[PDB]
Amino acid sequence: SDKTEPRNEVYKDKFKNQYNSWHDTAKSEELVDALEQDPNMVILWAGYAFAKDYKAPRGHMYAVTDVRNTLRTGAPKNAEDGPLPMACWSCKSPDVPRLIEEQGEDGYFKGKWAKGGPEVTNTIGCSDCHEKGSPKLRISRPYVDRALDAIGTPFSKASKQDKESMVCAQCHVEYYFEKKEDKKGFVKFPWDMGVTVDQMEVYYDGIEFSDWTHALSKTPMLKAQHPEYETWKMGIHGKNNVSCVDCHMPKVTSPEGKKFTDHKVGNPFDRFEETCATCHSQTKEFLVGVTNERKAKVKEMKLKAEEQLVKAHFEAAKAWELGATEAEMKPILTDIRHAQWRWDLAIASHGVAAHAPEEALRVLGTSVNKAADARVKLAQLLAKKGLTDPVAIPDISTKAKAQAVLGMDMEKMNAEKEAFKKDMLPKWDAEAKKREATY
Amino acid sequence: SDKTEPRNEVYKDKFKNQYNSWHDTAKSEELVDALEQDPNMVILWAGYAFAKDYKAPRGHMYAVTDVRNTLRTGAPKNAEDGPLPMACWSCKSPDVPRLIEEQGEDGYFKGKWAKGGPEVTNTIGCSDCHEKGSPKLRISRPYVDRALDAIGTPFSKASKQDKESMVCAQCHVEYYFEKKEDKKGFVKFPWDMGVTVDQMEVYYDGIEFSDWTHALSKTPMLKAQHPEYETWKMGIHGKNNVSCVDCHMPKVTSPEGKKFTDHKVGNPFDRFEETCATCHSQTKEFLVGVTNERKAKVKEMKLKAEEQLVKAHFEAAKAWELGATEAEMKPILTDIRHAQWRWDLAIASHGVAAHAPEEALRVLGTSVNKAADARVKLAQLLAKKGLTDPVAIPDISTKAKAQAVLGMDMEKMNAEKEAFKKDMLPKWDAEAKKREATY
Ligand code: HEC
Ligand code: HEC
Ligand code: HEC
Ligand code: HEC
Ligand code: HEC
Ligand code: HEC
Ligand code: HEC
Ligand code: HEC
Ligand code: HEC
Ligand code: HEC
Ligand SMILES: [Ca+2]
Ligand SMILES: [Ca+2]
């Protein structure tokens, strides 16, 4: 494509300071296993890909590696195999706008994730945010322009300060895959009714959309994903239009005293002077302390919401086992769907305790309120089927125990994934090397 | 006494600007009936004085008037009559340090509220916060000193900025009346553990303390009251030691050009220049909009928490009615106690949406979590008693209907109060005038 250069090294000794700091996200290499740290999530996501594997994000340099390696994308043997579609590449690589610009959105989104393996081998890079070889910013994905239009803030009419967050909003948002034949597997941001948890809930309910049917409760479930842009808009910094870039890509000075934009996307406290100290006079120790306090508050309510949902899902499973009808279960499943949507949207962003802690805490409160409705209705229904005692919860104290409770063959899944990693990934990179040898 | 002057006019000509702005809290005279606006509260406080009458605070000039007029103090015919004790005067008048200094705490707290009628007639004034005829600040109540010592911040070692909030903390706190024999009727702040909702819950459970037994659920209840200091400490302004005085008693300039401390304690937005604008560049409309949005979020979770509690109380009443035993109800009552403690502390301060919105939202979330646990246990227990259908809630849509549901003879209460107002209060004021003549 004329508009995209997916090879990130092309403009490196033309834009040295930007390339070098961009490459330094490789320094953020630790992989924290969130399922291991919180096995409740295996149960909440039962029947869905996230019950297999879910880790915290690390540096942008690892995006293609991590989508390749997660158990969620499976072990496809050919371009028509594997569980997930092409759309799983969309926020991982500057080869995505290359493919969209050459084949159109309809050509890009067609088919399996495995199909794009040979084509999507460059990780998150310059062409995702920039015009080719230029410092100018751009939106490189058409579905992003559609989403910005939908909330009335098109990129073409946005201020410089607005665009700084919009380039991150290409990826750091809640999304779903459309179902209609002409948009099958297209990425869409569910923003037509607004970006609050309540508006998005109305959107999804209006089209009767579900990401999966829960393996225990049979609830039509919604999955939230990293809603940084939607939740940043709710926090006081976003209300002041303090941009993602102000904290995550701050203006820094070279050893020679030249200012440039720090491209090492990571922890803003690592550049405390240049980030928080730009606008605040408090010490780093104070502001780190405040941030850790909100993380603790959000975590407390997160676990309370999760404990209610775990019990709700097993209680619903027991209700089905005791002969509940679909009509008896319909209002309970609605409550479970909404309760878990609210928990998931509240904490799916690993930055929410910094970006919008009060919104996270409000939303987790509404989660518990819906879970309480579901569980009281379940307690009455279970009693009509003859059970007036608590429903037993199996041992789910570890990720391995939870996945086994669900009947998941983790040994086989890991073995097949390792064989895929060893056999298929070399072939993909060998094909990409051959193709890039043109260009 | 030597160290207190309760007549607030004595130094009016020496300190004209302070006296004049102090007297201007009489401009804040609107009375908002909180029970009328939220009749749920009648049910939540069933069996307690707050089910009778509860209004939003107004100006300091009305403290003695409102404590005289509230149905909560009833209609005493003599100094040993009436529902409430001497300690209800403690945060309403500079006559209180006068009586404490002359009679001791033991002498002051002894007896009924009606006994203090003739002695406590000056409203909140200069000697409550100041040394006599002086600009120096003081703590005028010994139980406040004990509380400050308990949290490790004695007034003697406090900074200027610390002391600005501490004078408000003499009254704007959660408290209880001790029941121990040697301290019976004493005001104490429940801060030994210290000031979060969770620490105070541990404090109260450790001494097996209850304010009343709920009229419906028979739960041993805790009542929260206006925890401004404790919640201010949790908000970001308090963490920065932005004092109550910075927003509510700002430095202003007289018409003659003289700088002084504004003593019109009221809405900080009424002094936007001089309060927020001294630290913030945003417009007043923007900051008002933010505070209004937080008020709405807090109100949304407040109402969800109350709906859960109202149903829990009626469901518990049903369980008792169906023959539940003490042992069956014990874990349910514990959950209701904690759930309502958390609700009440979260919203008992009318400023919590400005002072600490994130803490109010966290605490309201934990309220719903405990109410959930109570209602699920109740649904199972009700089913063991043969009831598998929802418990009916009577019409409680107005203050009047809710009080009638509880069997409250509001007509008699109001008649007896008006009679008390017409007959007793002139006698109290006449005796005080006679006594103050001898000053
Ligand atoms: C199709 C269902 C997929 C799959 C299989 C993956 N993604 Fe994404 N992704 C996006 C962003 C902003 C992040 C970092 C923020 C965060 O994770 O909270 C990620 C992260 C990942 C990972 C690493 C972490 C993990 O979950 O283990 C993996 C393995 C992963 N993704 C796989 C952004 C997006 C999107 C932007 C709209 C899209 C679409 C996807 N991701 C889709 C998928
Ligand atoms: C791949 C290694 C690159 C290269 C070579 C560059 N970028 Fe970026 N960039 C991003 C943002 C938000 C800005 C600020 C824009 C502005 O203030 O107008 C920049 C800035 C630049 C410049 C301009 C000079 C400067 O340092 O300020 C240049 C020359 C540049 N970049 C080169 C955003 C992003 C990304 C979004 C996550 C990504 C990816 C990149 N840039 C990648 C690259
Ligand atoms: C606009 C300048 C931003 C900002 C501020 C961030 N991103 Fe991204 N991001 C994407 C994916 C898939 C990941 C996970 C990577 C992986 O786990 O392999 C991330 C990761 C992050 C982080 C975590 C960094 C760390 O060191 O832990 C952060 C702080 C972050 N992002 C912020 C996806 C994308 C994009 C897809 C092309 C785009 C564009 C951005 N992110 C842009 C931004
Ligand atoms: C604009 C919408 C964004 C986006 C997309 C992100 N941020 Fe932030 N962020 C800030 C701080 C202090 C943290 C936590 C640092 C810590 O944990 O110590 C975060 C966290 C994130 C994450 C998660 C990072 C991870 O490794 O898990 C992500 C993906 C993220 N942010 C993206 C600080 C700020 C701001 C300061 C006022 C601003 C504005 C933003 N971030 C904006 C955004
Ligand atoms: C760097 C990572 C940080 C951190 C840790 C914080 N900020 Fe900011 N901040 C800015 C503005 C305009 C406000 C609103 C208040 C005001 O009008 O001054 C804030 C507010 C905060 C808070 C209070 C909100 C809360 O979370 O309790 C906190 C704790 C906070 N900040 C921490 C402005 C800016 C910036 C201007 C572009 C920048 C950069 C930052 N802040 C960065 C940080
Ligand atoms: C330290 C300077 C303060 C500040 C900032 C406030 N108070 Fe008080 N207060 C007390 C009582 C009994 C009331 C209710 C009076 C009534 O309704 O009759 C109040 C009221 C307030 C308000 C509401 C003002 C309004 O205009 O509505 C406000 C903003 C307020 N207070 C703040 C009791 C006391 C004390 C007991 C003697 C003392 C000391 C303080 N308050 C101190 C302060
Ligand atoms: C003994 C049980 C009583 C009674 C009957 C009253 N008080 Fe107080 N009071 C205090 C503060 C800071 C306020 C204003 C803040 C707020 O109300 O949220 C009040 C207000 C009142 C009112 C007017 C409002 C109402 O409830 O209608 C009334 C009628 C009232 N009080 C009666 C402070 C304190 C204390 C400081 C530790 C103490 C002790 C009391 N009050 C005790 C009582
Ligand atoms: C009853 C009408 C009075 C009078 C005559 C005065 N006060 Fe107050 N005051 C309070 C606080 C926190 C301050 C600031 C203290 C400081 O910054 O050191 C003041 C200030 C004064 C002064 C000093 C001159 C000035 O205007 O700054 C004077 C002479 C003065 N006051 C007289 C607190 C309170 C109260 C707490 C709620 C109340 C009640 C009063 N003051 C009452 C009076
Ligand atoms: C220090 C511990 C205190 C105390 C005792 C109080 N405040 Fe504040 N407050 C602020 C704002 C913007 C409001 C809302 C005004 C509005 O409703 O528009 C409040 C509210 C209160 C109340 C309730 C007022 C009422 O009339 O019902 C009370 C009793 C109260 N405050 C006492 C602003 C601030 C601050 C701004 C940074 C500071 C600090 C404080 N208040 C501190 C305190
Ligand atoms: C007058 C009643 C107000 C109002 C409405 C607000 N402030 Fe303040 N503020 C101050 C400090 C140090 C912070 C922390 C952030 C920082 O370090 O700059 C804040 C924070 C806020 C916020 C953001 C937090 C939130 O609740 O979202 C808001 C909305 C806010 N303030 C409003 C400092 C001060 C003061 C210095 C003495 C004064 C006065 C005020 N603020 C007054 C007000
Ligand atoms: Ca989604
Ligand atoms: Ca109390």
Side-chain angles (χ1 to χ4, degrees):
Chain A
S1 155
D2 163 86
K3 299 288 173 63
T4 296
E5 173 55 71
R7 300 168 302 176
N8 291 313
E9 276 71 72
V10 169
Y11 303 102
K12 83 164 156 192
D13 51 43
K14 153 56 161 336
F15 298 132
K16 310 188 193 282
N17 286 324
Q18 298 77 8
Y19 176 87
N20 287 343
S21 55
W22 166 89
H23 190 272
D24 282 346
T25 71
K27 289 181 193 301
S28 184
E29 193 177 34
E30 183 185 15
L31 282 168
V32 176
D33 185 337
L35 296 184
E36 193 73 57
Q37 303 203 333
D38 187 355
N40 289 330
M41 298 191 313
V42 174
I43 295 304
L44 299 188
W45 292 328
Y48 197 56
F50 280 71
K52 301 175 171 176
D53 202 4
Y54 174 59
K55 317 265 216 298
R58 46 166 182 179
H60 282 165
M61 286 301 310
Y62 299 101
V64 167
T65 298
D66 289 336
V67 78
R68 281 174 172 202
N69 285 359
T70 178
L71 298 183
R72 302 210 297 272
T73 53
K77 310 189 161 299
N78 50 74
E80 305 176 348
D81 196 18
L84 294 184
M86 270 298 296
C88 284
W89 294 112
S90 305
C91 308
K92 305 286 179 282
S93 164
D95 284 293
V96 166
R98 172 180 73 84
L99 285 172
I100 289 171
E101 288 151 7
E102 287 166 7
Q103 317 185 5
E105 270 183 301
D106 46 12
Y108 165 65
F109 282 124
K110 193 181 201 309
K112 293 284 186 173
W113 176 80
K115 207 238 285 191
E119 299 288 338
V120 182
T121 66
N122 294 279
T123 196
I124 296 168
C126 325
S127 274
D128 289 312
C129 305
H130 287 289
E131 300 290 343
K132 194 180 72 180
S134 170
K136 301 181 57 72
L137 299 172
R138 77 173 179 156
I139 299 301
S140 56
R141 329 289 214 256
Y143 49 87
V144 178
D145 287 320
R146 288 197 292 277
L148 294 167
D149 297 346
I151 61 171
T153 63
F155 189 79
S156 69
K157 300 183 194 145
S159 74
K160 178 187 189 212
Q161 185 69 10
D162 296 332
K163 293 179 182 188
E164 292 185 342
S165 299
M166 292 176 172
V167 287
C168 316
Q170 299 180 102
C171 301
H172 283 271
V173 299
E174 145 69 3
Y175 71 90
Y176 74 102
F177 296 160
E178 303 195 67
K179 293 169 130 283
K180 52 188 65 168
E181 178 71 10
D182 56 315
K183 310 296 182 190
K184 198 178 174 80
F186 281 39
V187 176
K188 177 168 179 189
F189 305 169
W191 294 356
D192 300 16
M193 309 291 292
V195 300
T196 74
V197 60
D198 307 277
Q199 292 162 334
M200 290 191 280
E201 185 175 274
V202 167
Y203 177 80
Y204 281 127
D205 281 357
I207 57 176
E208 302 184 2
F209 182 85
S210 295
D211 286 288
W212 84 105
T213 302
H214 196 274
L216 300 176
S217 59
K218 311 181 199 288
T219 305
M221 302 297 294
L222 292 172
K223 181 81 190 75
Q225 279 97 358
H226 36 67
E228 273 85 50
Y229 196 60
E230 302 92 326
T231 56
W232 162 86
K233 281 177 169 283
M234 305 301 111
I236 191 66
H237 283 111
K239 290 180 162 291
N240 282 273
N241 209 24
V242 178
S243 67
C244 325
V245 167
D246 281 331
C247 298
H248 288 277
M249 288 187 62
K251 291 291 180 283
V252 302
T253 75
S254 68
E256 300 67 56
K258 303 291 190 176
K259 274 205 152 162
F260 66 100
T261 293
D262 184 3
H263 276 56
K264 197 282 186 184
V265 172
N267 187 337
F269 288 114
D270 286 351
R271 299 275 184 271
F272 179 84
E273 195 193 335
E274 298 117 24
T275 66
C276 323
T278 290
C279 307
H280 297 294
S281 51
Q282 299 89 340
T283 72
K284 181 174 176 181
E285 300 50 61
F286 179 82
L287 295 181
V288 166
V290 170
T291 304
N292 287 337
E293 191 213 65
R294 275 77 175 283
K295 281 170 164 176
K297 295 186 175 185
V298 172
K299 186 180 146 92
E300 174 191 26
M301 276 303 301
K302 175 182 179 292
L303 292 179
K304 288 179 184 219
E306 291 176 10
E307 282 286 346
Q308 297 291 351
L309 282 168
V310 170
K311 295 181 203 178
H313 283 295
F314 278 102
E315 283 150 14
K318 177 63 62 173
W320 290 120
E321 173 189 350
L322 295 183
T325 72
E326 292 251 43
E328 289 168 334
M329 292 297 287
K330 181 183 180 81
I332 293 159
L333 307 188
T334 296
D335 285 343
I336 293 178
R337 167 188 171 91
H338 291 160
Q340 181 153 326
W341 172 242
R342 287 155 180 277
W343 159 82
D344 210 3
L345 197 69
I347 50 74
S349 170
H350 296 279
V352 77
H355 300 153
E358 77 301 325
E359 181 65 352
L361 288 161
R362 183 193 71 95
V363 176
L364 289 164
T366 69
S367 176
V368 182
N369 180 67
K370 287 288 161 184
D373 288 348
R375 289 193 67 211
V376 169
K377 292 168 194 187
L378 276 163
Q380 294 167 6
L381 175 63
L382 285 163
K384 291 185 184 297
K385 309 310 189 189
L387 177 64
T388 64
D389 291 318
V391 175
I393 307 305
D395 188 352
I396 54 167
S397 53
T398 71
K399 162 193 181 182
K401 280 169 171 193
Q403 295 170 319
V405 161
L406 297 183
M408 303 165 74
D409 191 349
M410 295 317 295
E411 180 185 282
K412 179 177 172 183
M413 276 182 30
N414 282 295
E416 291 185 336
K417 188 71 182 189
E418 287 291 309
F420 161 81
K421 293 167 61 185
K422 296 165 178 171
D423 175 76
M424 196 63 52
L425 298 178
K427 298 178 187 172
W428 289 359
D429 293 310
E431 172 164 359
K433 183 184 178 69
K434 194 180 181 77
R435 176 188 67 257
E436 296 192 331
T438 76
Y439 282 25
Chain B
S1 75
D2 300 320
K3 305 206 295 190
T4 295
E5 175 55 68
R7 296 166 298 164
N8 293 312
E9 299 70 47
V10 166
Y11 305 98
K12 80 194 309 296
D13 300 317
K14 181 174 183 188
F15 301 128
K16 293 173 195 174
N17 287 325
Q18 297 79 10
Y19 175 89
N20 287 340
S21 55
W22 165 91
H23 190 273
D24 281 347
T25 71
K27 289 176 187 293
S28 181
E29 99 170 326
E30 159 163 77
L31 274 170
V32 178
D33 189 329
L35 299 183
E36 184 73 29
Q37 293 187 338
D38 187 4
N40 290 337
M41 289 178 140
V42 172
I43 300 307
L44 297 189
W45 291 324
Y48 200 57
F50 278 75
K52 302 175 179 179
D53 194 9
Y54 174 62
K55 317 255 211 300
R58 55 174 178 167
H60 281 168
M61 288 298 310
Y62 298 104
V64 167
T65 300
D66 290 334
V67 70
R68 289 172 165 200
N69 285 354
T70 178
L71 294 184
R72 302 209 295 277
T73 50
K77 310 263 212 315
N78 60 68
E80 177 36 50
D81 204 13
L84 292 189
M86 271 294 301
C88 285
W89 293 112
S90 302
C91 304
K92 306 288 179 287
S93 168
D95 279 307
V96 166
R98 175 174 72 80
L99 298 170
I100 296 174
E101 276 145 20
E102 288 178 15
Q103 307 169 1
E105 267 184 302
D106 296 278
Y108 164 70
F109 283 120
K110 192 166 50 56
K112 291 289 193 179
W113 175 80
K115 182 178 84 171
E119 304 281 343
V120 185
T121 68
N122 295 281
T123 198
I124 299 167
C126 323
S127 284
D128 286 312
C129 305
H130 287 293
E131 298 294 348
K132 191 180 69 182
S134 170
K136 296 177 202 151
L137 301 184
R138 72 163 179 163
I139 297 302
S140 52
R141 328 292 214 255
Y143 50 82
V144 180
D145 278 322
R146 295 195 288 272
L148 295 166
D149 294 347
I151 59 168
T153 61
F155 189 83
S156 61
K157 300 182 181 81
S159 77
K160 182 188 201 279
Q161 294 67 35
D162 296 341
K163 292 181 182 189
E164 283 179 357
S165 296
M166 290 178 171
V167 290
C168 312
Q170 301 180 93
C171 304
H172 279 278
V173 296
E174 148 67 5
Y175 69 91
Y176 70 108
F177 294 164
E178 300 194 70
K179 292 177 179 181
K180 311 192 331 290
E181 175 215 297
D182 66 324
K183 305 302 168 184
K184 158 252 153 194
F186 281 52
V187 174
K188 180 169 176 182
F189 303 170
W191 296 356
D192 304 20
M193 297 293 294
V195 301
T196 72
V197 65
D198 310 89
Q199 290 162 337
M200 296 191 283
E201 190 177 89
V202 169
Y203 176 82
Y204 278 128
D205 286 351
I207 58 166
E208 304 195 308
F209 181 86
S210 288
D211 284 292
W212 84 105
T213 295
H214 198 273
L216 290 182
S217 56
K218 309 184 194 304
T219 304
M221 302 297 294
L222 291 174
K223 180 78 192 78
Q225 285 95 354
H226 39 64
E228 273 83 49
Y229 197 61
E230 303 92 327
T231 57
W232 166 80
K233 278 177 169 291
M234 303 293 100
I236 191 64
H237 285 108
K239 284 174 164 308
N240 281 275
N241 210 23
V242 177
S243 64
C244 329
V245 162
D246 281 331
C247 302
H248 291 278
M249 282 185 69
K251 295 297 181 271
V252 295
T253 49
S254 71
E256 300 77 38
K258 303 312 177 181
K259 185 170 150 302
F260 73 96
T261 292
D262 188 4
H263 279 59
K264 203 288 197 184
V265 169
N267 183 341
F269 281 112
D270 292 346
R271 292 278 175 279
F272 180 84
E273 72 309 319
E274 299 126 2
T275 62
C276 328
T278 72
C279 298
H280 297 294
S281 64
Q282 295 92 343
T283 67
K284 178 176 179 179
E285 46 259 60
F286 175 84
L287 290 175
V288 166
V290 173
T291 69
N292 283 342
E293 194 168 294
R294 272 76 174 283
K295 286 181 174 183
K297 290 172 160 44
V298 172
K299 185 194 175 102
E300 174 191 20
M301 279 297 307
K302 173 177 181 290
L303 288 176
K304 288 171 185 296
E306 295 172 10
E307 290 293 326
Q308 295 287 358
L309 285 166
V310 165
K311 291 177 209 171
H313 284 300
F314 278 99
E315 287 154 9
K318 179 60 65 170
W320 292 116
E321 174 189 1
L322 298 179
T325 67
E326 299 280 357
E328 289 170 334
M329 294 295 293
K330 184 198 176 81
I332 291 162
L333 303 192
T334 295
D335 289 340
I336 294 181
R337 167 186 172 90
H338 290 158
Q340 180 150 331
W341 169 242
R342 287 162 182 273
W343 161 79
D344 208 2
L345 196 84
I347 50 68
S349 170
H350 299 267
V352 73
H355 302 152
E358 70 303 322
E359 180 69 350
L361 290 164
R362 182 192 72 91
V363 174
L364 282 167
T366 70
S367 175
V368 175
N369 182 66
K370 284 302 185 192
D373 293 337
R375 292 191 65 216
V376 171
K377 292 172 203 184
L378 275 164
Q380 295 169 12
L381 178 57
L382 290 169
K384 291 187 186 301
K385 308 304 184 178
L387 175 62
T388 63
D389 296 313
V391 174
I393 306 300
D395 183 352
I396 51 173
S397 60
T398 69
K399 177 192 179 189
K401 283 174 173 175
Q403 291 172 150
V405 160
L406 300 179
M408 297 172 70
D409 187 4
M410 301 308 299
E411 177 169 292
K412 185 186 227 179
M413 280 184 40
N414 278 297
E416 291 183 334
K417 188 80 187 189
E418 296 300 321
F420 159 89
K421 288 163 68 179
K422 184 189 199 298
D423 306 321
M424 283 299 322
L425 294 178
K427 298 175 185 174
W428 289 0
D429 288 326
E431 178 173 340
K433 156 159 276 191
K434 181 178 290 177
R435 181 190 62 255
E436 299 195 325
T438 74
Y439 289 174

